[PDB]
Amino acid sequence: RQWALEDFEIGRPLGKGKFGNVYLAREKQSKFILALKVLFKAQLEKAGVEHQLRREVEIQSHLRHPNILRLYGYFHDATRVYLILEYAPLGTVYRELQKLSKFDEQRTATYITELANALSYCHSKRVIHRDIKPENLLLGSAGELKIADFGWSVHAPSSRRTTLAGTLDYLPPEMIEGRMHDEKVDLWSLGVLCYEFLVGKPPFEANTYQETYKRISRVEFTFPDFVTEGARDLISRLLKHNPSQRPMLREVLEHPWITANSSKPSN
Template sequence: MRGLFTVALKARQKLGKYKIEKRLSEGGFATVYQAFDTIEGHRVALKIPHAHQMSDDLLRDFRNEARMAARLEHPNILPLKDASIIDDYFVISMPLGERTLADRLQKRLALKTSLGLASQILDALAYAHQQKIIHCDVKPENMVLFADHRLRLADFGIAKVALKTIRGSGTGTVGYMAPEQAMGKPSPRSDVFSAGLILYRMLSGEWPEWPYEWPPAGIKKLRAKVHPDFIAFLKKAIDPHPRNRFRDCEQMRNAFLRLKPRVLSYAERRRTKSA
């Protein structure tokens, strides 16, 4: 393919039918912009990979992954609206949310809010695993929140290609990545691990860190907040050894749904007792 531009896009710049409004974020693989679709008349998010990342081989990988991701139709999965080359830019168009879960985590989450978000994360991943698809990059930055309190997991199909490219360039972070995935051996249990880290963070306010020894930071807050059985659930999810985890997010989601009423009633009893 032809060489791609390397300069950043500017506000009011036109890119095909899209008018760039502002830059939303930038990572090791791509920059995300808010843009206005002048044909359909609504705002979208445009993910544009960095020019030095792109190649014919990468585009071929993207085509294969996009076709795979197109099979995923779920209310908690962000759909890929379009992926095409416009004015020498490779442009991935997606619905525009209000903010990411990473943004939301800057402030404390109530227990019910955390459990509601956790349920949506696990529903999305359970559905993907039923379709034999692994996300490979489950992190708060890839979870988009919408006005109706819906969480939608983004970058299915993009994540696998992006991670391979970032690893090849020697950049990126393994902060949410299962140990075996960092060694190049991802499986559904790797998504389980990443989801477990996020649930732990939402409920305790702390991120478990490598080497993921138990108990992690924040365990006192967690024990004061949730039922002991749910702590055991989280411990199983973020076990450094993949064979000790849930086999996939469908099994993890089912365990979560069994425990959720127990967590809520436990919290209510503690609230009543302390009143």
């Protein structure tokens, strides 16, 4: 009655992770195509992030949204932990960005709309993703954006958080400055992401992380000349140093620049 490793044929690696690989998978009976996320228990327990894996599995499995990747189930075998994820045929936005160097305003606004919708749903359930980045954004069979990797996420209806969570180039100032943080970290990373979609590079990118920490804390960056006034306005609002001064996701979805370039409506 329970999941077993024998239930799946393992295909090519879909991507490498911090504690194991994600493989293309086939349920032997129904021939249903899936993604199998494999995590070694030794690496998880050594780094002491088992509690975070609990959060990833429990939170993602109970979420239901067209723009959020589905986690159908999980199982383990005293050596590895296996996550059964929804298959995203067109790969990452990261690979797409690398392929295209940069997105135009139509594509960028479309991705932001889909992402803001999914995040708005997350925050309504008091969930914070805390790891928004192109590598963690997948594309469906019709090119729809879907959030993935809830490996840094947390259910916080009560507490404000203290965990240094996320990825270097996308880390909010409050985390860097050793402050507490809330759901407003997703809107900072949304601003960092919108910049990278248009420019092709993170706004605080540097050779060292110490310099990156400095630039993030100062919110020290510039736009290339071709970035439109509407795009500059949206990004600047999302990249406020003061977390409470950052807009709401409802305000992002109703942003003039967003509604004039997006190919998809709001929730």
